[PDB]
Symmetry: C2
Subunit: 34 residues, 2 copies
Amino acid sequence: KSEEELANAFRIFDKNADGYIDIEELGEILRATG
Amino acid sequence: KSEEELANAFRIFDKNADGYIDIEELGEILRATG
Ligand SMILES: [Ca+2]
Ligand SMILES: [Ca+2]
């Protein structure tokens, strides 16, 4: 459950060189969970 | 909530000071605020 979920909420938002997330993508994560 | 406010949030999360967030760091963000 938990393990899979993480990889997804990385990869969904995470367009560029993802191994990483940036500021806009960070905004998106915040928008998803609150 | 603003770009200015989010800059701080980014910094809080960006533990390893790389100007990015990664997979493990993402966990912390996802958890907030369930
Ligand atoms: Ca990315
Ligand atoms: Ca980081």
